[PDB]
Write a protein that binds this DNA or RNA. Structure first.
Lengths: 154, 160, 161, 704, 42, 99, 50, 55, 117, 165, 41, 55
RNA sequence: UUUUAUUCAUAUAAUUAAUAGGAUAAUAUUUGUAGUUUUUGAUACCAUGAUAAGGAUUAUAAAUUGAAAGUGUUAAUAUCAUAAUCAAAAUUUAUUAUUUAUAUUAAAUAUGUAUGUGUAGAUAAAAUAAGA
């Protein structure tokens, strides 16, 4: 797309921990919903993470209930189970978002950023006009007309 | 109102290209005008590096002047007219008055007694009626008369 | 001054600095007050004279009040006479819109571009000659196509030195 | 007030004043003339004029509830939420109709911007001394600004000075009221006043104004009644503030009233660690302190000029409070005489001045300081008669004889005084140079020209270079020098060397318009044009000498060339001696490189070359593509069209209007700011964080 | 949030009985939170 | 320690690098080449002898044609511009020192 | 020409290519000959002066 | 690159798309010689010549 | 984030009466009836086609709340209706379902207590 | 775009009127305004940061010239700039004296009026007292640094310093 | 304190000390001095 | 017009009349609170120059 | 048998004592006021103050939009009141929080060298209009 420079990768836990700033930003979530809808597939994981984020952000101000009253034997384990279950749902949504972004890029002839893999037509990470002459993680030298991934016309 | 940005992002530690973070002088910002301020590559501050590309004031003024140029071009694209000097005798009654200069009076109105309250300085007159004054010697048939739809006519839109 | 810049040596230059800083003199004159009959028997400023005066004083006139702020000289005694002289010059030049209509300032009128209904005839001007030329241009186009795969408008009608 | 809070009291006041706002009343004052912007702009917005009716669903639901269910739908205001009380229905239950023109406020961005800028600009354009009755309207206005280190100090000083000025003004206005009443009881009309009234040559009824003592006394009585009313208003507003209830800030309640002003607060930010530790530690050890100065403004609006009151208010600086200062602003009515003699009204010169006369340093080189010297003396010529002199000077015989009545007759050569209101008065230092022909030395030439020898030498210039040591050698070189130019001080004007000999006829000027413009008779114009009665036949029509209103050659207040030639005479002599034909400022192929050779006055973006067919698509078609096009260009009007608006670029100069596409702006040669920002007025104050203020005046200080 | 608070106050001024629901929902409750001021130390 | 932009308290800290071919004129010199030479190139009054020319003086042809010795102040006691050439014309002395 | 607006207009004719000895194999400038020696000038000072 | 973009803007047959829709190579990539075919060309240019990246 | 990436750079006023030879027909935004039908189709057909909340239907309010809220958000402009129909996913201050869940839970707790007693 | 600005004379006009360029020339003559000829028409940049009410820093006046290549060297800046005479610089140059009690009055005159003799500085007095105490204690190790050594190297006739011990 | 004496005019300490007038007072005129009229020169 | 050390000494002593505010704020001034040093700079310029008619 | 970051750049050169008023004022050449030469702490020493680091805990429930940042000491440093032979213009001299790939030098002389899969050890910071 318009962003073609080198990029670093971050664990999904970091983006999930980022709340209603990037991961749960309503505009970005609406864009993801539009991407799913224009492809005509259900947005079940997106809606699950949306309701999870809404519930979390609504009560983030409130103080936690007294932990002494809660039973460490069972209540703490139940809370950890629920937190892990929510985190797994958000992981699934994150993976789905990345997969569908790659797929839409491939369909629309959109050249991704450097070292970005688009299954079906790159399969090893497209790199073009990078600061390093060689392909990162592959050590393959790169030509100046970097790579024509798609057909010329249109 | 406006939705875009007008102020240059502040100088901090090096911004890595990741989620919700962009390099400070990436080609996306300001359309492509961060190219002027971009100091490509890792820079050793001891010897390499131009001062003005790091000075927060000069880059801010550059962003301001770029935004001013953008505002000027977007404003001028709205112009579907030109200003012509008329000898004050052939203008209609709504123009035969003491029009104050810009920023020297309250926004005036064209003949408020005629139930017209629009700004007088933003009135635009078509040539279909002004051809007589603009081109008296030419005559002939230039800019044929503008057909005006009859409001009081039973057409399809009137549920005829 | 009355606090610490009196009764001593620095008081003099402090007072001189204050006077130089406050040398500005503002002269205000109303257009309604100007619109009176003069000694000769005519109105001192008419509608055209007022319009010319407003054009001459782009920002010096405002809310119907002509204001001239003179900081020309270090003292108000000379600022006032400079302001009166400049106001007299401005009035003399503005009264010029009474000797004839040639001195009447023109109204800057926003005249629109020709509308779409007028623009629609741009295709139909010289229609018959255009079609007659187009027939022989098609003849030339097919003659060129008989020998060339791609024919540019340069071959048919475009002219390049 | 118990009715509303601060914002309620503000917006209700805004609505009330807009409900009776009238644009005509806005003249004179400043920001007070601007109405409530929210309602004014929404009234000026055309889209708000059309108010959509209630929707079909709304009207159908209301009709079903009323005519079918027998239950009229209650408005939210009239319906009662309280389950324990029946509150009375407010009068504004459903009576107030809905209109987009009034509420809510919707405006357009251009109108909003223009209104805001105009309201900011028009603040000092307030006419304080008017003829209005009430709080406003007076003769003199005094604004005393009291400055103190502490707010309560300046407040108490304001109260003390206000009470003192209240007493003093009551005394002065009381004595003035006594005088006004005594004048109103009876008086004698001043003969000087009657003569002043009887001074207009033509009155408002086409003739003399026969003003008598009865009418002048009536006008004086009206003025005295107005003055008495104003004095009574001042006294009544001054007699109000008893100790029990005193409102010093209200103009109606107290005189003189006091109004607040924003204090001058200047923060100083400095490091506080005496230890010269690291920069981070120094920055962490940073404290903010500020210098404060508090101001109060006292306004005294008196209906007359009172020197005693001015003295008593000036002398308050002697008994001001501790560590308190004061400054005085005076706004008084004055009379300014504008005579048509030193600043006359006439035709523009035949050859108008161009932009080249308005250049940098041009004000000191080719522009005199107005008014220009117009000659009042005149030397009568041989053969000119009493009426001929008046005709030549463009004045009446009666005016001429009134100007020179001590002389019964005018001799062949006499120095007379032209009437002050003459329309054909010459101008000193006529443009025509004076030439002396010698056929002889420098001393003889100076004696015959009545000029100093040094001035003659410096004005001649080349004569000095040609002449050697001996006056005999100077006389020998006089043959080569031929005519000598007289000094500028010796030049004399002529009755025909100042006014245009021919006049330019307009497109639609007949034989009457030209005569009217020149103030001559049609028969005289026809006789001076050799009897031709066709204006269209000739492009230029000569102006007869009988014209009362001629056209000058050039601008009268224009410095001649000799004036600056005397300023730089030695440069001319040196250049003539050294034979400096030209000084090439640019190299050979300077224009070859369009970016290296930039003058300090050169600007960006550079203007591309002009093409004779890029004005419009019709011209482009007629030139290049389909040259068989009948129409040459678009039907341009006969009147001037300004492409760059509201700019006023010099005509005949190739220029480009602001670009409309981002590509042009981006790819055009436009630099960036690489050094410090420099401002002509902000060269002082140094930079931000180094802001310099000589005087700690309030930031929103209003000049008189 | 500022717009919501202003509208809630306007509603309370207009219809007095609407004060109870908005107050119970905490729409007229202002928060005194403020962004950190400028300081060269940080 | 930080100081206002283009107002560094150090005046000689400016290290004039090797001259750049693409500009070679819009760097360490006058912004316009139609401006007059600075005052250091000329003699104001009757002096008794200049110790060494300052580094702000521009280089001219007369420096190499006249043959008179020219020297400037640098890290050592003095530096004389021995072996005059014509390649350095239109440039100031500060661009030919490399401190 | 500076590369700001016009750089492609530079031509080798502007380059003297005679006051230096260049590498006949690579093309780089190997050495530079003396320039002040027997320099040819019509007027060391501008013609109009003196 | 600079004169190419200026020519594309002057011809106007493409319109305002040059800076809004058209994409162009970076500075040091578009300053390469005519035939390179290798991304490791900007690092192989002459280093002894002080020309601010102009070969 | 820019919804107007492909929008035209015109900024030009247009008057069909003065700029066309055809009869102008003015079309306004949806009224109450058309807006209700349009929104009912979008929500219910989307849910039936598998493009709506589906199993998470209880996460969003009922149709009446959606119709009321979206109408305010869009102003009954058909494009605004579509946009806010998609943007409904990020609604934060809709407490209808939360209150109903508490009320129904309270109802069943009382019902179980009545059955036990 | 690129074009040539046209001017039409009132005499050539079908109906005469005062042209805006002529009015501009008259106003420039009245107010002694320098008409800049090389001002490009495509640089009508509004200082939006100070003119737009939508901005925080709105002031209603253009606070910037919007020219990147603007400095104090150019003659336009020289002509339209403000001289520092009678400014805060002039105030500081006379008020920021290291010794405050010297801008009001001369120290010698003030001493000769209020007191009978000119007093020395506090530091000078402290040095004199310390010298007195040192002379009382030791009376050795002191130098004889003076301004003029003539009176010490050639003492006046009849001068005999008495010894100490 | 110090070789440089304090300025009694602008120093808040001496201005608001016990021996001078504090800023929480009416700040009226202390005494109506008249020198030139009692004994002119 | 004194150094930071001198100003700090005079503030800690009773030699200057200043009013202490928060060390990490903008102060009492509305121009400072509504834009900062540059805004107060512009306001000072407007008061000094950009309010007169300048005949 | 919880979260964030860290490659940081100038640094020495030589001389420091006094007061003296002008137009519209009833008179001052005081226009133009003339008595060399007996003293000595910092061109390099004042030790004493501030600062750095930096913590404390009562507000039940209803109402209200409310009723809510505070420092010793230990340390280092330094230009102040305290102990005579010498740093501030001729600056190289190494002094923490920097612009990374569509377009890159026009106004006071304003930076040509560190691309290498962003890969160590240590160090600092915060629960403050944000969303552990």
């Amino acid at each position: 797309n318009t962003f073609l420079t080198s990029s670093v990768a971050t664990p999904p836990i970091s983006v999930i921990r980022t709340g209603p700033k990037w991961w749960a930003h309503p505009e970005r979530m609406v864009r993801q919903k539009l991407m799913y809808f224009t492809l005509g597939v259900d947005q079940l994981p997106l809606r699950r993470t949306a309701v999870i984020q809404r519930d979390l952000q609504r009560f983030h101000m409130c103080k936690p209930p007294p932990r002494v009253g809660d039973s460490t034997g069972y209540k703490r384990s139940r809370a950890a189970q629920l937190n892990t279950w929510y985190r797994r749902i958000q992981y699934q949504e994150y993976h789905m978002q990345h997969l569908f972004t790659r797929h839409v890029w491939g369909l629309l002839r959109v050249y991704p950023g450097n070292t970005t893999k688009i299954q079906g037509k790159a399969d090893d990470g497209y790199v073009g006009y990078d600061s390093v002459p060689f392909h990162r993680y592959n050590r393959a030298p790169l030509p100046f007309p970097a790579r024509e991934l798609y057909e010329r016309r249109k | 109102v406006s939705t875009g940005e007008f102020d240059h992002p502040p100088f901090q530690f090096r911004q890595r290209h990741t989620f919700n973070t962009t390099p400070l002088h990436d080609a996306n910002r300001f359309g492509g005008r961060t190219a002027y301020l971009r100091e490509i590559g890792p820079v050793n501050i001891k010897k390499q590096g131009r001062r003005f590309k790091k000075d927060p004031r000069t880059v801010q003024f550059n962003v301001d002047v770029w935004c001013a140029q953008q505002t000027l071009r977007k404003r001028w694209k709205q112009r579907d007219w030109e200003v012509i000097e008329i000898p004050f005798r052939l203008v209609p009654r709504e123009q035969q008055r003491v029009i104050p200069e810009l920023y020297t009076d309250i926004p005036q109105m064209t003949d408020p007694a005629r139930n017209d309250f629009s700004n007088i300085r933003n009135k635009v007159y078509d040539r279909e009626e002004l051809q007589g004054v603009l081109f008296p010697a030419a005559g002939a048939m230039l800019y044929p008369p503008l057909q005006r739809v009859d409001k009081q006519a039973m057409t399809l839109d009137k549920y005829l | 001054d009355n606090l610490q810049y009196k009764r001593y040596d620095w008081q003099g230059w402090y007072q001189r600095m204050l006077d130089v800083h406050n040398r500005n003199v503002s002269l205000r004159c109303r257009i309604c007050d100007l619109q009176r009959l003069d000694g000769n028997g005519v109105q001192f400023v008419d509608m055209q004279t007022e319009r010319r005066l407003r054009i001459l004083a782009q920002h010096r006139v405002g809310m119907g009040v002509l204001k001239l702020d003179a900081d020309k000289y270090e003292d108000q005694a000379d600022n006032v006479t400079f302001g009166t002289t400049k106001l007299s010059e401005l009035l003399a030049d503005a009264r010029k819109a009474q000797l004839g209509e040639e001195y009447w300032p023109s109204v800057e009128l926003k005249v629109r571009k020709p509308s779409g209904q007028s623009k629609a005839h741009y295709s139909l001007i010289d229609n018959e000659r255009i079609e007659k030329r187009s027939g022989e241009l098609y003849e030339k186009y097919r003659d060129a196509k008989k020998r060339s795969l791609f024919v540019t408008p340069m071959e048919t009608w475009l002219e390049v030195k | 007030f118990n009715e509303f809070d601060a914002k309620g009291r503000e917006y209700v006041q805004y609505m009330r004043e807009f409900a009776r706002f009238d644009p005509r009343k806005s003249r004179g004052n400043g920001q007070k003339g601007f109405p409530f912007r929210d309602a004014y702009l929404t009234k000026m917005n055309e889209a708000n004029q059309k108010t959509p009716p209630p929707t079909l669903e709304t009207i159908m639901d209301r009709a079903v509830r009323e005519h079918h269910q027998h239950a009229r739908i209650l408005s939210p205001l009239e319906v009662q939420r309280d389950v324990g009380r029946l509150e009375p229905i407010p009068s504004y239950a459903g009576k107030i109709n809905a209109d987009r023109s009034v509420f809510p406020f919707q405006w357009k961005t251009e109108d909003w911007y223009e209104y805001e800028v105009a309201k900011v600009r028009n603040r000092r354009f307030v006419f304080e001394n008017t003829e209005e009755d009430g709080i406003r309207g007076s003769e003199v206005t005094y604004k005393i600004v009291l400055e103190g280190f502490w707010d309560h100090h300046v407040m108490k000083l304001a109260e003390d000075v206000c009470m003192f000025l209240k007493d003093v003004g009551r005394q002065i206005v009381e004595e003035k009221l006594v005088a006004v009443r005594r004048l109103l009881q009876g008086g004698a009309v001043d003969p000087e006043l009657l003569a002043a009234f009887n001074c207009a040559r033509a009155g408002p009824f086409g003739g003399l104004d026969e003003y008598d003592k009865e009418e002048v006394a009536n006008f004086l009585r009206s003025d005295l009644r107005r003055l008495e009313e104003q004095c009574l208003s001042v006294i009544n507003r001054c007699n109000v503030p008893v100790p029990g209830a005193t409102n010093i800030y209200d103009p109606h309640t107290s005189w003189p009233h006091v109004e607040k002003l924003e204090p001058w607060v200047r923060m100083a930010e400095f490091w506080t660690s005496s230890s010269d530790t690291s920069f981070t530690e120094l920055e962490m050890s940073t404290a903010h302190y500020e210098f404060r100065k508090f101001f109060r403004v006292i306004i005294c609006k008196l209906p007359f000029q009172s020197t005693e009151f001015e003295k008593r208010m000036y002398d308050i600086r002697h008994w001001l409070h501790r560590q308190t200062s004061c400054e005085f602003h005076t706004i008084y009515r004055r009379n300014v005489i504008h005579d048509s003699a030193v600043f006359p009204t006439e035709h523009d010169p035949a050859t108008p001045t161009t932009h080249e006369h308005h250049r940098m340093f041009s004000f000191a080189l080719d522009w005199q300081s107005a008014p220009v010297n117009r000659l009042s003396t005149d030397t009568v010529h041989e053969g000119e008669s009493w009426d001929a002199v008046a005709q030549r000077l463009g004045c009446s015989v009666g005016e001429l004889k009134d100007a020179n009545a001590e002389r019964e007759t005018i001799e062949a050569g006499v120095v007379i005084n032209v009437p002050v209101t003459a329309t054909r008065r010459l101008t000193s230092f006529g443009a025509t140079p004076l030439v002396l022909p010698l056929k002889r030395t420098w001393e003889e030439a100076a004696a015959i020209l009545d000029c100093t020898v040094e001035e003659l030498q410096q004005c001649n210039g080349h004569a000095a270079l040609t002449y050697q040591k001996k006056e005999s050698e100077a006389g020998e070189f006089d043959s080569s020098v031929t005519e000598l130019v007289a000094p500028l001080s010796c030049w004399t004007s002529t009755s025909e060397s100042e006014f245009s000999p021919v006049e330019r006829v307009h497109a639609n000027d007949t034989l009457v318009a030209i005569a009217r413009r020149l103030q001559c008779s049609e028969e005289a114009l026809r006789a001076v044009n050799d009897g031709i009665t066709d204006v269209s036949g000739l492009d230029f029509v000569r102006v007869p000498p009988e014209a009362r209103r001629p056209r000058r050659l050039v601008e009268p207040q224009l410095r001649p060339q000799a004036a600056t030639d005397a300023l730089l005479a030695r440069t001319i002599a040196e250049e003539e001696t050294f034979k400096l034909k030209s000084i090439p400022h640019l190299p050979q192929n300077a224009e070859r490189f369009p970016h290296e050779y930039h003058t300090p006055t050169s600007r960006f973006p550079p203007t591309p070359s002009e093409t004779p067919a890029t004005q419009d698509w019709m011209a482009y078609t007629a030139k290049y593509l389909d040259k068989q096009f009948t129409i040459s260009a678009e039907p341009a009007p006969v009147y001037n069209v300004n492409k760059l608006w509201p700019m006023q670029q010099i005509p005949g100069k190739v220029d480009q209007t602001p670009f409309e596409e981002d590509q042009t702006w981006l790819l055009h040669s436009i630099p960036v700011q690489q050094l410090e920002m420099h401002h002509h007025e902000k060269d002082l104050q140094d930079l931000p964080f180094i802001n310099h203020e000589q005087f700690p005046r309030s930031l929103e200080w209003n000049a008189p | 949030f500022a717009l919501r608070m202003a509208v809630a106050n306007a509603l309370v001024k207009l219809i007095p009985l609407t004060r109870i629901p908005l107050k119970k929902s905490g729409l007229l409750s202002v928060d005194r939170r403020r962004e950190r001021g400028q300081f060269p130390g940080y | 320690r930080k100081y206002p932009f283009l107002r560094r308290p150090h005046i000689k800290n400016t290290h004039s690098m090797n001259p750049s071919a693409p500009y070679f004129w819009s760097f360490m010199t006058a912004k316009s080449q139609m401006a007059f030479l600075p005052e250091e190139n000329y003699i104001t009054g009757d002096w008794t002898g200049k110790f060494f020319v300052s580094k702000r003086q521009v280089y001219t042809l007369q420096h190499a044609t006249s043959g008179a010795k020219v020297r400037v102040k640098s890290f050592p006691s003095i530096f004389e511009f021995n072996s005059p050439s014509r390649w350095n014309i239109g440039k100031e002395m500060n661009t030919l020192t490399k401190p | 020409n500076r590369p700001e607006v016009a750089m492609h207009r530079n031509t080798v004719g502007l380059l003297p290519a005679h006051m230096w000895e260049t590498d006949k194999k690579t093309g780089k400038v190997k050495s530079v000959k003396d320039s002040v020696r027997d320099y040819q000038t019509k007027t060391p000072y501008p013609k109009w002066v003196q | 690159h600079r004169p190419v973009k200026r020519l594309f803007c002057n011809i106007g047959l493409m319109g305002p798309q040059i800076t809004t829709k058209a994409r162009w190579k970076p500075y040091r990539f578009a300053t390469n010689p005519a035939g390179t075919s290798k991304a490791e060309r900007m690092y192989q240019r002459d280093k002894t010549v002080y020309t601010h990246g102009h070969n | 984030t820019d919804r107007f990436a492909n929008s035209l750079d015109e900024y030009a006023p247009y008057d069909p009466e003065k700029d066309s030879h055809f009869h102008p027909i003015q079309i306004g935004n949806f009224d109450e009836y058309e807006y209700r039908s349009f929104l009912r189709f979008l929500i219910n057909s989307g849910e039936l086609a598998g493009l709506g909340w589906g199993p998470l239907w209880h996460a969003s309010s009922d149709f009446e709340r959606k119709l009321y809220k979206i109408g305010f958000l869009s102003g009954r402009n058909p494009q605004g209706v579509v946009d806010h129909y998609h943007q409904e996913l990020v609604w934060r201050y809709d407490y209808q379902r939360t209150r109903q869940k508490q009320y129904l839970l309270k109802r069943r707790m009382e019902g179980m207590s009545r059955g036990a007693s | 775009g690129v074009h040539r600005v046209g001017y039409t004379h009132p005499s050539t006009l079908p109906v005469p009127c005062a042209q805006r360029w002529d009015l501009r020339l008259a106003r420039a003559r009245i107010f002694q305004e320098y008409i800049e000829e090389k001002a490009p028409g495509a640089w009508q940049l509004e200082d939006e940061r100070s003119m737009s009410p939508e901005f925080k820093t709105f002031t209603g006046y253009p606070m910037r010239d919007m020219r990147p290549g603007y400095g104090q060297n150019l003659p336009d800046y020289i002509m339209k700039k403000r001289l520092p005479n009678n400014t805060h610089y002039e105030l500081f140059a006379r008020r920021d004296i290291p010794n405050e009690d010297n801008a009001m009055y001369g120290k010698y005159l003030y001493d000769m009026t209020v007191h009978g003799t000119s007093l020395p500085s506090t530091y000078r007095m402290h040095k004199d007292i310390n010298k007195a105490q040192r002379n009382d204690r030791k009376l050795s190790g002191n130098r004889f640094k003076v301004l003029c050594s003539s009176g010490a190297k050639n003492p006046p006739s009849g001068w005999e310093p008495i010894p100490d011990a | 304190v110090g070789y440089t004496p304090v300025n009694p005019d602008t120093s808040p300490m001496v201005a608001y000390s016990q021996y001078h007038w504090h800023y929480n007072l009416p700040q009226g005129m202390e005494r109506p001095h008249s020198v030139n009229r009692t004994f002119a020169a | 017009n004194v150094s930071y050390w001198t100003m700090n000494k005079m503030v800690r002593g009773g030699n200057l009349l200043v009013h202490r505010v928060h060390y990490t704020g903008w102060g009492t001034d509305s121009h400072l609170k509504k834009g900062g040093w540059e805004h107060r700079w512009n306001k000072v310029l407007q008061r000094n120059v950009l309010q007169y008619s300048r005949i």
